[PDB]
Design a protein around this ligand. Structure first.
Ligand SMILES: *OCCCCCCNc1c(NCCOCCO[C@H]2O[C@H](CO)[C@@H](O)[C@H](O)[C@@H]2O)c(=O)c1=O
Ligand SMILES: *OCCCCCCNc1c(NCCOCCO[C@H]2O[C@H](CO)[C@@H](O)[C@H](O)[C@@H]2O)c(=O)c1=O
Ligand SMILES: *OCCCCCCNc1c(NCCOCCO[C@H]2O[C@H](CO)[C@@H](O)[C@H](O)[C@@H]2O)c(=O)c1=O
Ligand SMILES: *OCCCCCCNc1c(NCCOCCO[C@H]2O[C@H](CO)[C@@H](O)[C@H](O)[C@@H]2O)c(=O)c1=O
Ligand SMILES: [Ca+2]
Ligand SMILES: [Ca+2]
Ligand SMILES: [Ca+2]
Ligand SMILES: [Ca+2]
Ligand SMILES: [Mn+2]
Ligand SMILES: [Mn+2]
Ligand SMILES: [Mn+2]
Ligand SMILES: [Mn+2]
Lengths: 231, 232, 232, 231
DNA sequence: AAAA
DNA sequence: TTTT
DNA sequence: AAAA
DNA sequence: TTTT
């Protein structure tokens, strides 16, 4: 299948599949059962911020998710992405809903990759009606107040259940080389998760994948648009 | 047909199509007949450097080509690329040979594009791998040979072949202008090594912005530099 | 005296010194009498944005000032800063009030300078701390008030004071031009909030490049914008 | 005294002060006795490259020193620079010689700092005769083939013993804030260490210090222009 | 995350 | 460097 | 880093 | 908004 490494902003605890009993951030390595998690105090309708970092030296994938005027959440997992991912990858944001639902609004996404030096950088602070350096998969859309809406939102602004959508940057990234001195990537995105319901689901993920990655069929809900099963 | 705006490093004067009677740098807008040129003192087998710049304010496309410890060459043309290009483009390097030949070696290529309605794209190649998947290679272009980009065919001994044409396009489309936008800018830098046995080299290198789906137009070896289907 | 090149956001028309009879943006070169101006539709209490650009190729200094969902203003002047400025400079924001007054609030300031003989300097302020040690604060300028830079004096209730002048210079000198150099460029962006009770605001904000040792010239409140010792 | 955190490229083993019996790279925290070291195969007269990285998340200071076509060296030490350094600092390169000598030539120096976002970046690939965004201390000089020569080199190109010199970037850097989400810095420099003698000494360091840092008197040789004593 |  |  |  |  697809090979996936993601940082999940999981809003809906699924204990059936190893999620803690609380909204959490996790590092996922080729499984939705996160290799490490941390408690995350998600804030309904507040604009939040995610930072994902990694290098070839420390080989440590870390993330930090923040809101204005509140303690942030942070998770870290030592993994050699030489041993998980192919040298060439695409990077993306994925989001899903199931029985329960939420807006998965992205307001900004930036990415920097360095490899010795070769460099790639992009920054989206607005998203146009037809954003041709993005590959939109499933329910993802652009042009709605200059935002990226990963999951379906009706004309009345109401979020839909059983939705899944991703956004991949068009150009493949060189993420690791055998004969390389230093490699690093940084990712930042701002998100707005809103539910009128007292159960928000299912969350957002930054993800690196094989270039040809697709939404695995039925990967709505707990699977967050990343995984075909919950192993 | 393709819509093309290029900065040509033209090494071979083609008088049949308006090229001056000397190696020149020029701005080409939907034609190989440059809108403006300048004398260029090309140095056979010396590593040279090109800088291309533009913004939505001055709407002036300029370029500067340099060698170590020698006077540079410069050309400038006022053009609104809002009126010339589609909003969405790919950026590339093209090179060709014909009857006469030269190595069209690229050692480095960087590109920065910024657009405030800030959105930004930046890439920098200082080495090129055997399989460079964020480049679309067209015709004879190849990567992996001493970490370089070889736009036109080169034998095992580095000896250049005639009647060759190749381009390299960055994979991701670029937002180069928007109607509802305050400031847009791009800069491009690349280093090149043009080498010929004999003091008769051809045909040159170009930085080019095109429609995303741009391909090497049929027969566009030699004078046409991998950009133009005819010489209008 | 100080050697000054500025882009003025002049809110108060001073006819005694050649200002047009409207709020304007202008290029000032060693004089408060702008070398060129343009009408500027200032918006009282709206967060606005300024972009200043220049390169050694076009040798054209341009600026663009914008508000949300409204036509921008633009001004451009051809000047060789090789002939005007010293090689080594400091960059700054200046603001002043006189008889009439306004908040001169800066919310963000970024600067990029590149010079190939590539040498590069980049800074970006999106928040400003209580003690910002990579800024040299001159006169009434202060930091820490809601993470902003307040160039001129503002009461506890945000009410602006008259007869105020303040500047903020980046601490490190910038290499803005070299004799033996191929390409040099700088860009500057800052966001500002100009607010007055009453439709009579004064006196405005400027991005400025100066001799490293530049100080607020004596008496340079009001029309002189913290830049000029007299109005020549 | 001055507060110093450095990555030392130590070419001369001083066993009297805890250096291993081989040329090494080390992390120094307010002492020349490195908190951690690693074997370094220094190459006489070859242009080498150093990378220093750190973030507020992993709070891990790492470095990697490389030459063309040879295995690199890398060292890492977990330290919270909130607890070592002041919020405001200057960054610099220091080099020294003693009884034994070497050219301490710097050909390039770049630095990036990010703090949430506020950012500082500089890159020197050439150094002019009068480089006014550098504070040169002791024997450091610029203009000699566009290089930075940290220690004294005679008119005949011969390196001098008992030399010490540093180069600090002019503008102070915000390296950590109490109420901050993410902070990172990256540093790259290329160096050319050459000795006609069979004993090269004493090495090069990237260093962060109090803004007002000075060459401690007699910090030639083993002390590398950083430390007043060898505790 | 709160009630059965 | 060939062709008018 | 090599010899005493 | 005052002064010619
Ligand atoms: O502090 C945490 C508050 C979250 C609400 C507490 C849980 N409430 C709850 C559960 N728990 C079992 C979860 O599995 C059933 C839901 O499965 C479907 O819905 C989710 C959400 O969209 C999705 O991940 C699945 O794939 C599937 O579509 C209940 O049954 C209940 O109520
Ligand atoms: O013995 C000294 C040789 C020096 C070369 C002289 C070049 N001739 C020349 C021209 N105009 C005629 C050029 O046409 C050449 C034929 O064109 C073919 O070759 C070129 C080079 O690859 C290519 O551009 C064409 O498309 C075609 O393949 C001058 O003005 C001048 O000098
Ligand atoms: O009741 C409606 C009031 C509207 C204000 C009218 C402004 N007057 C005016 C001028 N020219 C005269 C301006 O001189 C004002 C005195 O100058 C002092 O105040 C200003 C503002 O701080 C400052 O620039 C000076 O340096 C000095 O402090 C027009 O053309 C126009 O309109
Ligand atoms: O594989 C490693 C090869 C390096 C040479 C082997 C050591 N040779 C050596 C020593 N060892 C004792 C070192 O302390 C004496 C030198 O001290 C003076 O010189 C150094 C170098 O410039 C400096 O760090 C000190 O501060 C002082 O100036 C010898 O005595 C000998 O020979
Ligand atoms: Ca879940
Ligand atoms: Ca030609
Ligand atoms: Ca005025
Ligand atoms: Ca030592
Ligand atoms: Mn989970
Ligand atoms: Mn031509
Ligand atoms: Mn004015
Ligand atoms: Mn040591």
């Amino acid at each position: 299948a697809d090979t996936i490494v993601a940082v999940e902003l999981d809003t809906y605890p699924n204990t059936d599949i190893g999620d803690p009993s609380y909204p959490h951030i996790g590092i996922d390595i080729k499984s939705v059962r996160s290799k490490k998690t941390a408690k995350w105090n998600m804030q309904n309708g507040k604009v939040g911020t995610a930072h994902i970092i990694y290098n070839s030296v420390d080989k440590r994938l870390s993330a930090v998710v923040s809101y204005p005027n509140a303690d942030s959440a942070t998770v870290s997992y030592d993994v050699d992405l030489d041993n998980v991912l192919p040298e060439w990858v695409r990077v993306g944001l994925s989001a899903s809903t199931g029985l329960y639902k939420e807006t998965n609004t992205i307001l900004s996404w930036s990415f920097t990759s360095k490899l010795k030096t070769n460099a790639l950088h992009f920054m989206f602070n607005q998203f146009s009606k037809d954003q041709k350096d993005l590959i939109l998969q499933g329910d993802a859309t652009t042009g709605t107040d200059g935002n990226l809406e990963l999951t379906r939102v009706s004309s009345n602004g109401s979020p839909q259940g059983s939705s899944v959508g991703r956004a991949l940057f068009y150009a493949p990234v060189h993420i690791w080389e055998s004969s390389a001195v230093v490699a690093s990537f940084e990712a930042t995105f701002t998100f707005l998760i809103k539910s009128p319901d007292s159960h928000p689901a299912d969350g957002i993920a930054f993800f690196i994948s094989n270039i040809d990655s697709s939404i695995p069929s039925g990967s709505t809900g707990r699977l967050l648009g990343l995984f075909p099963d919950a192993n």
